[PDB]
């Protein structure tokens, strides 16, 4: 339930600021979009070795507070704060499985949490708010790391403010 912190030791803001997720296990990797299955348009959220420091995200909570706690249920999104595209969700899709993807809507409370993990943070997906979490990790397929549910095997990020 501590406050989520960026690399400069500042609390992460509620929607106001965008942050690069920086893997600590893949220096050359950054966040981006890839196609999955039969889709014309890229909708799956990937780490790309070919792409640092990454597309930046916002962490968003309906709570009228401008700090993020590890305990808050979040929406994570690419793009501007208020807008309703680039909102993260998990979709069961081959060949990846429980894949992190973007969509054009937003729920009141997101299904994601940011949690201290060893030396940094992991994203944890919650299919429902009462239940325990599913760490988000990486599926190496067709030369990239698709973000997807891999419990016990999280991808660790530092949160760098885009500035």
């Amino acid at each position: 339930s501590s406050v989520v912190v960026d690399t400069n030791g500042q609390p992460v803001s509620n929607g106001a600021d965008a942050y690069y997720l920086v893997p600590v296990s893949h220096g050359h990797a950054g966040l981006a979009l890839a196609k999955i299955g039969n889709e014309a348009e890229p909708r799956a959220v990937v780490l790309d070795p070919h792409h640092r420091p990454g597309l930046p995200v916002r962490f968003e909570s309906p709570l009228f507070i401008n700090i993020i706690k590890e305990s808050y249920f979040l929406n994570i999104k690419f793009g501007p704060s208020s807008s309703d595209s680039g909102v993260w969700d998990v979709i069961q899709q081959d060949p990846i499985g429980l894949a992190v993807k973007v969509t054009d809507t937003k729920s009141l409370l997101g299904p994601f949490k940011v949690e201290k993990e060893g030396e940094g943070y992991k994203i944890v997906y919650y299919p429902e708010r009462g239940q325990t979490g599913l760490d988000i990790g990486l599926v190496h397929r067709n030369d990239k790391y698709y973000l997807a549910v891999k419990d016990g095997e999280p991808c660790v990020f530092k949160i760098r403010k885009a500035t």
Binding site: A16, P62, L63, F64, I65, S81, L109
Partner: protein, 223 residues
């Protein structure tokens, strides 16, 4: 506060700031040594500023008193946002003046359509962010529980009410959490949450303080 106005020095003397190296939450002074805020504002070694109107000045008839105790509601439901109330015991009673006074707890629950005063130092924009220097104020009416549960299917419990404008323009916003909602001169609400700020059909949700007065009085009695 979006669509609000400058309160003025002396205007909201029961408003406090919760501080841990920075402002993060509003609160309400309910007696010389007890503050109400949101359970979701809970943080270790909170320091309360009182008598501040300008949040970025180091002096001005002000008091900075550490919490001695920060007591979240023992039913606080971080999944449902239910029972979103916290009492803070101050380590020393505040000294009272033009800018520092307590609000009292309500006799009874406020009814839909009653006008209220909401105050804090949160964001003043619907899209983007502008944080004020001075405390801002908003008159916001209470909405029916049918109007509220409608706005937020499944989420409105018995310990919540909606205030504001389903038309948009005017609402609490990020940084106002834990601050006062005062109706007929009593603390009726605590700023909790809403879908965005000042959007159509997406009003503010406030902790229903009338439901908690027995607990507050009993928690003060015992602590």
């Amino acid at each position: 506060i979006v669509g609000g106005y400058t309160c003025g020095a002396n205007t909201v003397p029961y408003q406090v700031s919760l501080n841990s190296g920075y402002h993060f939450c509003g609160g309400s002074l309910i007696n010389s040594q007890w503050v109400v805020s949101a359970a979701h504002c809970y943080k270790s070694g909170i320091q309360v500023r009182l008598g501040e109107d300008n949040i970025n000045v180091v002096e001005g008839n002000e008091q900075f008193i550490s919490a001695s105790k920060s007591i979240v509601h023992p039913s606080y439901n971080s999944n449902t946002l239910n029972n979103d109330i916290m009492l803070i015991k101050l380590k020393s009673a505040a000294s009272l003046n033009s800018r520092v006074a307590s609000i009292s707890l309500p006799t009874s629950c406020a009814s839909a359509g009653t006008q209220c005063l909401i105050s804090g130092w949160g964001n003043t924009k619907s899209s983007g962010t502008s944080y004020p220097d001075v405390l801002k104020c908003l008159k916001a009416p209470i909405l029916s529980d049918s109007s509220c549960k409608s706005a937020y299917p499944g989420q409105i419990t018995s310990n919540m009410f909606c205030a504001g404008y389903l038309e948009g323009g005017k609402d609490s916003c990020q940084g106002d959490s834990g601050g006062p909602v005062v109706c007929s001169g009593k603390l009726q609400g605590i700023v909790s949450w809403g879908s965005g700020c000042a959007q159509k059909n997406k009003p503010g949700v406030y902790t229903k303080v009338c439901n908690y007065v027995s607990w507050i009085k009993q928690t003060i009695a015992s602590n």
